[PDB]
Every structure is written in C-alpha cells, then in structure tokens.
Symmetry: D2
Subunit: 333 residues, 4 copies
C-alpha cells in the first residue's frame, strides 16, 4: 500500500484525502499547507458545506492530524523543495496547490525525498492521464505526471466511447461549471481573466478552458478535432458537459445510448456512468463517477450531428480519480 | 396610436405594460387578471426585484389603474370570452397568461370586442413572428398571431445574419436560461416535465425547448436544419444562447464578427446587438435587445465549424419586441 | 406498531415518510396526493436535492408504492372526507397539505376511518404540541392535534430551559429562515402576504410568524411575554433562531451554557442540542434535532439581557418530531 | 471644491468615485491600486454587477483615467507613504483598502502630501463620524478620521432618533448582511474568523461586529448600552438591521412611526429614510440612504420592549456618506 503526501489542503487536497481514507487504496501519511495549521486542518476536514460532515474521526494529537486513527505528519512549508517528504515516508506526492503545475516546479517535491508527483491539474509539459482512457500508457520511468482537469476527465471517457464506435470528425463542447475557489463573491480583481473577477453569485460568466483540446492529448486520434469553452454559473458544485459533434459513421440516438450503456457496464464501470432518469445537477452530489451520460437530456439533429450531455461532480469525481490513478501507479512499481 | 389590452399581469404582462408606457409606441387601456386585484396590481407594477422600481406614477383611482396619469380599466375575468375589451376600447390584446396559446383559445378575446390578439409565447397553430426577421410578412388578414418565444427572438436574428452570409448547413443550440415563474423554490410537483419541478435554487436543470426548431418557421430555409435544448440555472434573469453550426461557405471568425457588427449597425439595429467587451450576464439587465452577439466568448474550430454566443434579457428584450410588433401592426391598419 | 397514512406528499409529507421508514417507530401504510401519481411519487421520494438520494428501495408495484419492501396504498383524492383510510388500515393520519389546518377541515379524515389526525403545521383551534416541552399533556380524548411549526419546535425547547432556570420576563425573536415551497422563483403573485411573492433567490424578505406567540401555548407561563418575526433568505434549507430576552434571575453567559448543555445531555437529548463548534447553517443539514444551541454565536449585554442563537433543519428536525409524536401517542393507546 | 484621492479601487473605492462624479460634491483627481492597472480600472469602473453600467464616459487616455472628461492620475504603490498625492493635487485621501485602518498606518498618506485622510472603515484609534449623528463634532485639528462602518451608519441614525425621543435603556442588534469581498465562494482559508471562510453561497454565517458597540462612540449616552452580532446570507448587496431595545419612556409603535417619519422629513432627510411600503431587500438597490426605517416589518411586545427594522444598501449608502462627509469637512477649511 503506497504512502501518500498531499501538498495543498484545499478542496481537492482535502477531498483526495477524504477519498483515500474511504477506499483505503492508498495511505495519506503527510500533508503540507502553510496557510492552514493543524487545528484549522481538523475543522476544514471535518466540516464540509457541499459534501457533509466527515464520517469518521479527525483530531489533532501530538502535533499530528489523526484521521480514523491514522497519524499524519503536518508540514507548513511555502517552498516545495523544503518539504521533508522522505522523513514522513511519503512516496507519492499530490500537487494540488494550483501553483506548481509545470514539470519543473512540481519537481521540487523530489528534492524532499518524494519518488513521484501527481499534479491534480492540467500541466503545460508533464504527461497527462485520464483513468479509463490512457492510464495504461503510464510506466515507471515517469516521476512527474498530471491527472488532467475535472472537465477533461468528464469529456475524454465519453469521447472515447463515441469515437471508437462512430468516429468523431469534429466537435465543440461547452461546460456549465459550478463556481470554484478561483472566483469572487462580488466584483473584484480577477486573477488572470477579467470576466472571472465578476461576482460569482450574480452572473453567468463565460470562461475559456483547454479541456476539449486536452482530450487530443489523451486520445491522439482526436487531436485537433475538438475545442470548446465554459460558462461559470452560481452553484456550489457539480457540472455538466455539452458535446456537439459530427459523426463519421451514421448512428441513431438509440444506438449511441446502447453503446454508452455497454461501456458503463464493462471497462469504464465506475468511470463513465449512464442514466435515463430525469436527473438534475444535485442528483450527482458526491457521485464518484468521472462522467455520467444523460440519455434523456441529449438531442440529435440527424444521424451525423448530435448533442451529448454528461454530468460530473467536479470535486468528488476528480478526487477519486487521483486516488485511483495512484493505486494504478503503485501496482506498477 | 393603437389602444392595447393586456391579459395576464405577470412578468411579461407587467413588463410589456412597463415597456409600452416608456416608448409610448402603444397605449395600454385595459388589463385583466383574476388573481390580482387593483391594489395588488399597483404594488406589483411599482416594485420589481429584477428591474427596479418603476420610474413614474402608479395608483389606484376610481377603480382604475393610473400609470403616468393614464387611467387603465381593470378586469377580473377567468374566462377570456367574457372580458369586455370593446367597452374599454382595447383594439389589440396581448395574451400573456401562458394558458391560451392556441389559435382557438386565444381567439376568445375577439368575442369581447378585440380586433387582434398577440400571444406572448409560441403557438401550436397561430403564425409566429420575430421583429427584424419576418415581421414584414405580417398582414391585416391575421387576427391572431404569436411573437414566438424569448429564446427564438434571440436565436433567429443571429441565425439570419449567419445564414444570409455563410449559409447554415446544420446547427444545434443550447441555452443557459435564468429561472422563471414556472419553476419551484424546492423539489415539488411539476407542471409538465419531471425535472422542472426540482429546486430551482439548487440545480442546473436540463430542459427541452422548441426554440431552435421554431427558427425554421420564421426562416423557412433553416427549417429542419436546427434543434437544441436548454439548461435552467439559478439566476433571476438574463440568458445566453450557444449556437454550434456548420457553415456552407468558409468564414474566419473575424469575418463573422465583421458581418454581425454591420448587421447591428444597420437593419437589425436595436434587435441584434454586438460587443467585444468582457461582459457577464448582469451586464444585460434591462437591456432591450432581442439578442447580443458576444465576440470574445465565441470560438471556432475551423472555417466551417463554429460556436457563436449571444446574450438576451429574456424579460425585457421580449417585452419590448411585443410592443415593437404591435407598433408595426398598427402602422399597417 | 401504529399504522400511518400521509395526506400530502410534499417536503414534509415525503420527509415524514422517510423518517418513519428509518426509525421504524411507525409504519406508513397509505399516502394521498391528487397532484402526484404513483410513478411520480417514486421519483420524488427517491431523489432529493437537499437531503440526498433515499438509502433504500422505492418502487411502483401492483399500483402500490413499495419502500424497503413495504407496500403502501396510494390515494388520489382532493377531498379529505373521501379518502378510504380505514380500508388501507391507517390509524393515524398526518395532515401535511397545508390546506386543512383547522380542527374542522382536518377532521374530514375521521370520516374515512382514521382514528387520529396530526396536523403538520400550526392550527387555529386544534391543541398544539412540541416534543420535550408539553407532549406529556397529550391524552386519548384528543382525535385532532397539531405539532406546531418548524420554528416553534426550535424556540420552545430553548425557551423552556431558559425560563425554568432564570425566568423569561419578556422576549423578542427573529428567525432567518430558508426558502420554502410557498415562495416564488421570481416576482409573482403571493399566496397571502405581498412581500412573500417577491423573488426568493434575489431578496431578504421580511415575514411575520406566530411561532414566538405560539410558545405561549405550549408553555403557558410564557404566554404573552414573547413575539417576533422572520426573514426569508436565499438558502434551500436549515434556519436559525435569534432569541433576545430579559432574565428575571441574573445569569452569566457561561451559566446559560452550562444549563443548556445539561438539558441536552438529559431530558431533551435528541430534541435540544448544544455546540461550541464554529458552525454554519449547512453543518445542520439532515440534522434531526428540533433546536441546537450555538454557544459561540450568542452574546450577552449584561446578566439580564442576552441574545441566544439556535439552529434547526426546518425540514428534517420537524419531520422526525412528527414521527416521535405519533410514536408517543401510540404508546398511550 | 476639494480635490480627492482614493486609495484602493475596490467596491468602496469605486463606488465612492462613482458617487463623487454624480453629486459633484468633491473632485476625484487621483487613485492608487497596485493590483489594478489603468485599463483594468476602466473595465471595473464601467461595468458593475450590482449597480449597473456607469452612466457616463470612462477611458484610458495619456496614462490617465478619464471619467466624464475629468483626467485622473493613477498610482500603483503598495506602500502608502510612497504615493505622490501632493503632485496630483489630492488634498483629501480616502483610505479604502481595509489594510490601513489605524491612525498610524493611514497617516502614511500625509507623507505624500495629503492634508487629510478619511478611513472608509472603523478604526481602533482614529475619531469616528456618522453623517447626521455627530459630524458637527468634526474640526480642522483632525487630520485622520474614520467614517465608521456600513452597519454603524445604519444603526446610529435610527438609535439617535429613538434615544432622543424615548431613551434607550439597553439594546441588542442583529444584522442580516449581504456577502462581501471578504468571503469565499467555497469552503476555504478565512482571513481571520473560522466561520467566515465557509462557502458564502451555501451558508448563513454567524459573524461578530463592533457596529452596535461603535454607536456608543458617536452617541456617548448609548455607550455600553448596545451590542450585537451579524449573519452573512447569500445575497450580493443590501443589508438589514434588527434592533431590539428597552425604552425608558413608554411609546406605542405608532408613536415611534410618527417620530421616525418626522426625523426623515427634517434634519436626517437623505440619511434616515422611512417607509410603510411592503418592501424587500432589492427595493433598496442603489439607494443612497444610510438607513431606512421599515414600519411594517417591525414589531412591539409592549410599550417598553420593541424590535425595529431598518434597511441599507451597504455599498451605495456608505459610499455617499464618505462623499457627504468630505463635502462637510471641506466647508470647514
Ligand atoms: N475546485 C475543483 O472543483 C477542482 C476539480 C479538479 C481539479 N482542480 C485543480 O486542483 C487544484 C486544486 O484546486 P482546489 O479547488 O482544491 O483549490 P483550493 O484553493 O481550495 O486549494 C488550494 C490549497 O493550496 C494551499 N496552498 C496555497 N499555496 C500553497 C503553497 N505554496 N504550498 C502548499 N500549499 C499551498 C491553500 O492553502 C489551499 O488549501 C487547482 O489547480 C484546480 O485547477 C480543482
Ligand atoms: N418569463 C419570461 O421571461 C418569458 C419570456 C418569453 C415568453 N414567456 C411566455 O409568456 C407567458 C408569460 O409568462 P410569465 O413569465 O409572465 O408568467 P407569470 O406567472 O409571471 O405571469 C402570468 C400571469 O397570468 C395570470 N393569469 C393566470 N390565469 C389567467 C387567466 N385565465 N386570465 C388572465 N390572467 C391569468 C397569473 O395570475 C399571472 O399574473 C408564458 O407563456 C411564458 O412561457 C415568458
Ligand atoms: N417546509 C418546511 O420546512 C416545513 C416545516 C414544518 C412544518 N411545515 C408545514 O407542513 C405542511 C407541509 O408543507 P411543505 O413544505 O411540505 O409543502 P409542499 O408544497 O412541499 O407539500 C404539500 C403537498 O400537498 C399536496 N397537496 C395539495 N393539495 C392537496 C390536497 N387537496 N389533498 C392532498 N394533498 C394535497 C401537494 O401536492 C404537495 O405535495 C405545511 O402546512 C407547512 O406549513 C413545513
Ligand atoms: N463592501 C462594502 O459594502 C462596505 C460598506 C462599508 C464599509 N466597508 C469597508 O471598506 C473597506 C473597503 O472594502 P471593499 O468592499 O471595497 O473591499 P475590496 O477588496 O472590494 O476593495 C479593496 C481594494 O484594495 C486594493 N488594495 C489592496 N492592497 C492595497 C494597497 N496596499 N494599496 C492600495 N490598494 C490596495 C484591492 O486591489 C481592492 O480593489 C473594507 O475595510 C470594508 O470593511 C465595506
């Protein structure tokens, strides 16, 4: 059982930790966050507005965070290279601060004694992976990798099934995404793009995303045939992907439904979901799937042009994939 | 100046009235709503959460609603055929209850003495019109007409310009729409579709719409080449249309921008807007345009496949179009 | 084990049912709702935006609603007196439509064969009860009773403890309440009071409540010494009570904390809760307590004038009390 | 006409600027914000989610911000003492960063050439003032002053009138406040109090405030007789104060209504408002009053114990008071 260290106790850092202690697939032994001390970590991990109170025990004991009886070493370093991952016995490190996404910056963890690093976000140069799509392409020579983005983990699975069966000639996607820590409560200085600084509670905010283009990296055949954008809307969690694409081989909507369902009962079980139920966003709260095909919400213009809908809990789904990914890597050691 | 009667003092009934008194294009002389008495009408017309307090005077005087000094006759009939439009001197009647959308049901107003009826919603059989797209096709032989839907008035104008210039081979649209009176505050009984009864404040709700297909009625050439669906998100007003289409003639994004801008400065001025500003939904509050092209939010995959974005205040824009339409009809008498 | 029938499958009707099947304190055998058919009942009971998917089995089988293997008879009557409670074997009936709150109207259920009726709301004439405050005063001669309101079940328990220990000279309360089915998504025609028709998502809405005055009914000594009002804010669930009162006997805040805590560990265990944690509204989601004293949020001006804060899940807490109440009545048969 | 400089182009800095250009009471000649450059300042000042697009002209011209034709010098200093207020000709400086509230820190502006400094927030040592309550007590010997807080400017005016007429023995207040820039979109590291870091969109958040206690500073007679707390709820703007107090001299609610109304038509005209209308929070959007008594929402237990309600646009009201205050100071030069 691989021992893990988490850098950045945010929504993803905390939820990866929560997912790790639930499946017991990996063991969190150390956490680092200079802006959150031990006592605060207990409070933030225990209580969660969107996912409910933690089912288990959380305590500060001897300067360590104890979850379900397991003591965790706490670090307060601002500089990654300074963190003593080795002494804490952390073999893999989850880079989830959103500030060290380049292969070089995320590599700082290796100086501390870590053996591998998983960036919980897209990376400009590090190899990106998506469970159920291209994780098999991972090997031991890789020390620094990326688990892509929440949106990419939703689109890729669906795109794979659709492409493998009918071939995607070209596609454009839109994602109606829930607000995130990046946004502001009221009009304020955005970090990066001007629209993102506008009140998150009052507006529908157009935003760019490289998610669709990133699918071209995990599924090379689709490289350059996809692109899209996003809309941030005022909900705390759970998002939906709207994929509009031209098919190479004709396919009635019911054939697409048949194909996606089989994929969800087979290889992609637990990754890609399938439903014909009259669902709404909150029905996916704390759902661990990376993507769930919504049969009733999609629509086809004809046998070559269709709009496919898929839901995803951007916090929970992604988090579990980070754990699933590490579990996979460990089995390759 | 044509005298108008409004059936149903709801969001649209009230806003059409507000728009009428502002432009003075038409004169509201009577209103009918069995679930709202005179005093309540004063309160609901004066105060408006989304559009602000009414700039003017509103009062109950001698059993009449007096707006800016103009006395309005009030009716409390549940049955349309019973309303005495003729005695009140109402020549045109705005059917905005959402319960009499068929040519037959909306015709009841003619028995009361009305000369023409405008359904403020799509109709199964009545001829639909969209200002700036096919209003010229209206003639005096038509007693009962429809002004289409908020969403159709947004899509049609944009589709027209895009089709006239590059030709739309096929298109699929999605609309992220603000909540409406139809929805529920918490999970409850749905009037029609099951998902629509789910809490409007907590969920992103997939919904079907005939808007895209309705564009085929006002723009015959596009008949059968368009379709789409909707997502209801938790905002009080203002919506956005996402049009994904294949072009017949190649066109760089900048050519599309050039073409739409010219259209907004010419014939469609006041109907179709154009902006390159970093806008968000609330920047369109109380905006009277039927549709506003958002240059920076759209994206193109290539010269034949592109995603176009257009904003619309589903309450204010539509309302003004209802008045504009009546003003047009009147000039044809 | 008493057999129960539920009239009105709304937020309370569904949650009382959910609470009944969980504690197994009572057995739901029949449900009546003319606006929701069997199949719809399955969907609405299974999926819940605020409390999550039902943890059990829900199905339509032989025209009956089957929850966790227990078949429930479904009725579609609009008129209470017509419901055949007797044939279904329902001894107690939960009146939760919000339309039959008078002793006379709620009595209609007796004609159908019901033996007792519990109004899940305040009543103008039926005897009101609050678990842990005056349920002991219930006896078999009562056929029609009321379980008060969500807010009264929160205030009463706290007031009791505070009065019994220091004496309440006079008090005024305010409740910041989550939105409910009564409100509108956008400015529209209000049930009874004009402000209540304003958009629930956009405004803080002042509202009157008889809750504080009702405490004078369950705790006669406080009769006429309390009153208050409410504010509806844009959250889907969970509310908080702010009690400001003058004490007869002096009492340091810490003495009040000591006293309330003892009450929560003793007689009121499960009814009145106590916490010193840095809580927020969502930390009480699906919490079954009727009221939870928040030590850190309250504040005292002096030893006789203080402001006490108590949280309550207005949906879940109340629902469990309805079941607890019926369980109590049954033990008195 | 006094020339003004604004330090910190945030919600208050921008709205003070907007209010200044509207009333023309003062002339903004310079603005300083190291996290917002000229072009960004144009965008943020022009578009406003809660108060609408700016009515006028805003442009970047020759490295200056030009509003309605008036050129404004832009500074990018992080350190107050470095800002060249003197060269820009700024006589008064509005300290609205929320980071320099002490008399010493805010004094740094004097080194740059400023003559006076107004802290747009409460201060630990600088003299606090509230228009219509104690501004007359301001004199030329004061170089550094405070305009108190949004909440204090709401409570003080009302308390004054109530105290002057019936005498306040003791009082406790609660304020249901809209979210602010301080809060987070999702559970995250709070700057300061632990509850304040919880998702602003999902929770009702208890918060402490020194507002009630600060009234004891602007109205010495009430010193030590008032205190209270706050609740942050999910609305973008507009807040309400709930004052519960014991009166020295008996007073029927209607006498309180008579007294407050007279005060709003007299001396406090423009500061303290009065209404008997069925209002809700959004009816106060962009309302420049510091406080507006809501007759219909309040309630009295008896002639000595009552609950008074007052609304306030925490952004707009406060902003205008900052300008009004400077206008007053200038008339004393
Ligand atoms: N928010 C989502 O739903 C979501 C889903 C998938 C992927 N992601 C990606 O994962 C990352 C995590 O985002 P998140 O929502 O958890 O954000 P977050 O802001 O909640 O978490 C970031 C954490 O980083 C900590 N931190 C900041 N600087 C640090 C430093 N120098 N060293 C160590 N720790 C530091 C912060 O204290 C905080 O707890 C982002 O890059 C995001 O793009 C987020
Ligand atoms: N709401 C929008 O933004 C929008 C945009 C485009 C089209 N529409 C369509 O316009 C219609 C107006 O919808 P709305 O949003 O104003 O709904 P609403 O509920 O706000 O207003 C409808 C009004 O109809 C009144 N009414 C009900 N039965 C009546 C009867 N028999 N006679 C007279 N009045 C009666 C109701 O009391 C209410 O005041 C609907 O068909 C809607 O689909 C709405
Ligand atoms: N919502 C709360 O948090 C809460 C807490 C305590 C008490 N209550 C009280 O409980 C009652 C339940 O309110 P609710 O919030 O669940 O509202 P709701 O609208 O969610 O539920 C009411 C149900 O009544 C049904 N109904 C309507 N007319 C009927 C009829 N003639 N016969 C049978 N069923 C009929 C409706 O279909 C609906 O399912 C109200 O009286 C309310 O005051 C509610
Ligand atoms: N938000 C309200 O409605 C309201 C009402 C009354 C009083 N106040 C008080 O006024 C102050 C203003 O709050 P706000 O809502 O505008 O917050 P804000 O974050 O919107 O504005 C603060 C501004 O400070 C700038 N800034 C940060 N460090 C700086 C530095 N060293 N030099 C110059 N500029 C710097 C930021 O870029 C930002 O634009 C706060 O102390 C607040 O408590 C706020």
């Amino acid at each position: 059982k691989v021992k893990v260290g988490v850098n950045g106790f945010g929504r993803i850092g905390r939820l990866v930790t929560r997912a790790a202690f639930n499946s017991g697939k990996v063991d969190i032994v150390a956490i680092n966050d200079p802006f959150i001390d031990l006592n605060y970590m207990v409070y933030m991990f225990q209580y969660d507005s969107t996912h409910g109170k933690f089912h288990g025990t959380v305590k500060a004991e001897n300067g360590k965070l104890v979850i379900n009886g397991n003591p965790i070493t706490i670090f307060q370093e601002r500089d990654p290279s300074k963190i003593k991952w080795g002494d804490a016995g952390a073999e893999y490190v989850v880079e989830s601060t959103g500030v060290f996404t380049t292969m070089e910056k995320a590599g700082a963890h290796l100086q501390g004694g870590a053996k591998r690093v998983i960036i919980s976000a897209p990376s400009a140069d590090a190899p990106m992976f998506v469970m159920g799509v291209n994780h098999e392409k991972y090997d031991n020579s890789l020390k620094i990798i990326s688990n892509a983005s929440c949106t990419t983990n939703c689109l890729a699975p669906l795109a794979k099934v659709i492409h493998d069966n009918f071939g995607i000639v070209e596609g454009l996607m839109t994602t109606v995404h829930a607000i995130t820590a990046t946004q502001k409560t009221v009009d304020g200085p955005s970090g990066k793009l001007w629209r993102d600084g506008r009140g998150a509670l009052q507006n529908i905010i157009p935003a760019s995303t490289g998610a669709a283009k990133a699918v071209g990296k995990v599924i090379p055949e689709l490289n350059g045939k996809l692109t899209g954008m996003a809309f941030r809307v005022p909900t705390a969690n759970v998002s939906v992907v709207d994929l509009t694409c031209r098919l190479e081989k004709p396919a009635k909507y019911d054939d697409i439904k048949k194909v996606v369902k089989q994929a969800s009962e087979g290889p992609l079980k637990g990754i890609l979901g399938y439903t014909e139920h009259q669902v709404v966003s909150s029905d996916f709260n704390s759902d661990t799937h990376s993507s769930t095909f919504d049969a009733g919400a999609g629509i086809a213009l004809n046998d070559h042009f269709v709009k496919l809908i898929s839901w995803y809990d951007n916090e929970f789904g992604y988090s579990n994939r980070v754990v699933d990914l590490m579990a996979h890597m460990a089995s390759k050691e």
